[PDB]
Write a protein that binds this ligand. Structure first.
Ligand SMILES: *c1ccc([N+](=O)[O-])o1
Lengths: 140, 149
């Protein structure tokens, strides 16, 4: 049961983010390339086809706190989105409402979180929600 | 149920016989993770500073090399903005005969003798090559700013 410490896990995620995964529909990287603490990340999700999110690039802020990956990261959309589990005024992702966060396991990662959010954009309860105008972002 | 003898040994020998200029202490939750402080070596622009380094012994150690990174900002052509280094003996030249100790005093040697000529040197290397006096003064400036507390 050898645990990889936070900082070395995040170094692994940095390398994976640079290499990219799958079809490139999610990506992640450090927000500040001088942040030795590896805390603040930028996430990207391409809205999936045949949903009201299609043909939009969503930017997110992902924060990996001191207990990551034992604890989930905090996530917020910067790009405005109407989606169950996302506060529609602030962009904050409610952990209790997104299963990967609510049921977080230490094997998960930033990639997993972003892939889950993209999968949930295809859900019946999200894919037909009418969206805010393209390109708008929340304040803060 | 526990750690390999080798790791028990290397740890205990570290606390009994530290490398001069290097403090190295295991983490309070993870017996494979160490918090290291390296003193800037004598006669370098890092002298008088103290530099945090973290070290991790992965599952396959010593088959696999230890992982290291600096966690104090440092101006050096072989240590990048995130504290990463490319030390031969941590990759291509790693072998189980080498120990943690070899790695630590080797990192101290790197601080003592920067190598801006390395293929994998970071973007600070050009200044080190072409205006070494200024690069060394900047290394001293960053030691004052980031490595004295
Ligand atoms: C390998 C990782 C970082 C460096 N560097 O020279 O900064 O080399």
């Amino acid at each position: 049961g050898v645990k990889v410490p936070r900082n070395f896990r995040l170094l692994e995620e940095l390398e994976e983010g640079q290499k990219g995964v799958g079809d490139g529909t999610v990506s992640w990287g450090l927000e500040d390339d001088e942040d030795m603490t590896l805390t603040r990340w930028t996430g990207m999700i391409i809205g999936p086809p045949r949903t009201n999110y299609e043909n939009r690039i969503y930017s997110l802020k992902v924060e990996c706190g001191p207990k990551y990956p034992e604890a989930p990261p905090s996530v917020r959309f910067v790009t405005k989105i109407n989606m169950n589990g996302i506060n529609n005024s602030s962009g904050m992702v409610d952990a209790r409402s997104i299963p990967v966060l609510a049921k977080w396991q230490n094997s998960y990662s930033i990639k997993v979180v972003l892939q889950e959010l993209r999968r949930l954009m295809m859900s019946k309860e999200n894919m037909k929600l009418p969206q805010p105008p393209e390109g708008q972002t929340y304040n803060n | 149920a526990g750690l390999p003898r080798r790791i028990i040994k290397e740890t205990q020998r570290l606390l009994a016989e530290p490398v001069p200029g290097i403090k190295a202490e295991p983490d309070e939750s993870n017996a494979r993770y160490f918090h290291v402080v390296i003193a800037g070596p004598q006669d370098s622009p890092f002298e008088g500073g103290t530099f945090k380094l973290e070290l991790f012994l992965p599952e396959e150690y010593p088959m696999a090399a230890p992982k290291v990174r600096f966690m104090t900002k440092i101006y050096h052509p072989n240590v990048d903005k995130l504290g990463r280094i490319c030390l031969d003996i941590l990759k291509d030249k790693w072998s189980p005969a080498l120990q943690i100790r070899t790695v630590l005093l080797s990192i101290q040697a790197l601080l003592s003798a920067p190598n801006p000529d390395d293929p994998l040197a970071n973007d600070v290397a050009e200044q080190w090559k072409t205006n070494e006096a200024q690069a060394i003064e900047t290394a001293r400036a960053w030691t004052r700013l980031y490595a004295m507390n």
